[PDB]
């Protein structure tokens, strides 16, 4: 039941400000704002409550404040860690008790563009041995985040048997994907390899793997 | 450290029922409220329900009423969330955390546990080996349902290097992931790499070692 912005950004060094408005059942009446910061692949961390206090350990480049109905949260001196969804949430009164905020994306501009990382498995003896065969291609610490992937048998495009994940976020604000090549172990022994093959921006990364 | 150590989640059909502890140390838990809170794949965080610090007194989103109950046990230091008539929206990470008062912020956070409400039955994944400066090997976890499965290195002994990879969701409605670590080359054929790989709801349990 709290609005705030889908996304902000802003370049390194800069101040952003993320805002929050409910209404005078929540944040107009009350000083219970809190505010999070999440990390892909992470639980919640607070980052303010009672709406400008800051929990030990938080960076005072994290301030909040709150005017009517419309609390802020502002990031000074913006740093490329600082990327993550925020949300605000306030109490409620009695019956409501507490609301969220839909949550911000903030970006952080300027990040290193980064070519993927790419590792290609062959099929293990012991998945050839129980009538199967899959390749694994294994994409890594790549910036920004759209890839399209194509696998080849020997040098002919390959489409059937072919699953590749979404990229995703990663720790380190890079992202990683995953493509999966279903062969049977005849196709496997009957080529002299397969290649994965990841584009990134223009830009092609190519791993390749033979039998045995 | 201070510690809130989840379980009781995983799979679900359609109008069952769950309960969810969520075991707490390293702070006074019968001091604090506490508090579940959802959050939905791709989705935003929504608060759940909340209890105060003696459990006398709770609270919970209207989405939930009549279907969850907040309690807690301050013995055990434990809180509990039972789920009951789950429905397929259910479907969710369920954090539980500490709040620094009741109805206001909440300073720590458990890790989350997967609720799944599906119909679709449990499957455990078949493992497999990845072997081929510096190189990678891992091991390839198939075809398993629901989400999630944990894997680690040796026990838990090696985790410098270790990446484990957003499982795909194939047409099937199986999942299969993959996880890497990347060693030394020198490494290979002389230290042993083994992954343990855990999927919870089919209580499959495997060592795979990797050569
Ligand atoms: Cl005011
Ligand atoms: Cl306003
Ligand atoms: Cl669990
Ligand atoms: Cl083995």
């Known amino acids: 039941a709290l609005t705030q912005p889908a996304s902000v950004s802003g370049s390194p060094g800069q101040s952003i400000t993320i805002s929050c408005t409910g209404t005078s059942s929540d944040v107009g009446s009350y000083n219970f704002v809190s505010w999070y910061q999440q990390h892909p692949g992470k639980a919640p961390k607070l980052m303010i409550y009672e709406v400008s206090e800051r929990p030990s350990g938080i960076s005072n480049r994290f301030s909040g404040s709150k005017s009517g109905n419309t609390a802020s949260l502002t990031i000074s001196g913006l740093q490329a860690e600082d990327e993550a969804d925020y949300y605000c949430?306030?109490?409620?009164?009695?019956?409501?008790?507490?609301?969220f905020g839909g949550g911000t994306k903030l970006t952080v501009r300027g990040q290193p563009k980064a070519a993927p990382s790419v590792t290609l498995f062959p099929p293990s003896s012991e998945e050839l041995q129980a009538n199967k065969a899959t390749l694994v291609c294994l994409i890594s610490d790549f910036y920004p985040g759209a890839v399209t992937v194509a696998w080849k048998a020997d040098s002919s495009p390959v489409k059937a048997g072919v699953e590749t994940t979404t990229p995703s976020k990663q720790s380190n604000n890079k992202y990683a994907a995953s493509s999966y090549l279903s062969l049977t172990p005849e196709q496997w022994k009957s080529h002299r390899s397969y290649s994965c093959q990841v584009t990134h921006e223009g830009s092609t990364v190519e791993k390749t793997v033979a039998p045995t | 450290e201070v510690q809130l150590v989840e379980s009781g989640g995983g799979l679900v059909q359609p109008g069952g029922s769950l309960r969810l502890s969520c075991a707490a140390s390293?702070?006074?838990?019968?001091?604090?409220?506490m508090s579940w809170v959802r959050q939905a794949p791709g989705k935003g965080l929504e608060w759940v329900s909340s209890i105060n610090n003696s459990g006398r007194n709770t609270f919970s989103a209207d989405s939930v009423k009549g279907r969850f109950t907040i309690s807690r046990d301050n013995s055990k230091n434990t809180l509990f969330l039972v789920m009951n008539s789950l429905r397929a929206e259910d479907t969710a990470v369920y954090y539980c955390?500490?709040?620094?008062?009741?109805?206001?912020?909440?300073?720590?956070w458990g890790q989350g546990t997967l609720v799944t409400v599906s119909s679709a039955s449990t499957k455990g994944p078949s493992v497999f080996p990845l072997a081929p400066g510096t190189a990678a090997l891992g091991c390839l976890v198939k075809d398993y349902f629901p989400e999630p499965v944990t894997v680690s290195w040796n026990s838990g002994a090696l985790t410098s290097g270790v990446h484990t990879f957003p499982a795909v969701l194939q047409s099937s409605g199986l999942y299969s992931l993959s996880s890497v670590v990347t060693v030394p080359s020198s490494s290979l054929g002389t230290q042993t790499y083994i992954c343990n790989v855990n999927h919870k709801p089919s209580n499959t349990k495997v060592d795979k070692r990797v050569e």
């Open positions: 949430s306030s109490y409620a009164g009695s019956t409501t008790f507490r609301v």
């Open positions: 390293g702070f006074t838990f019968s001091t604090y409220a």
């Open positions: 955390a500490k709040d620094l008062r009741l109805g206001g912020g909440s300073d720590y």
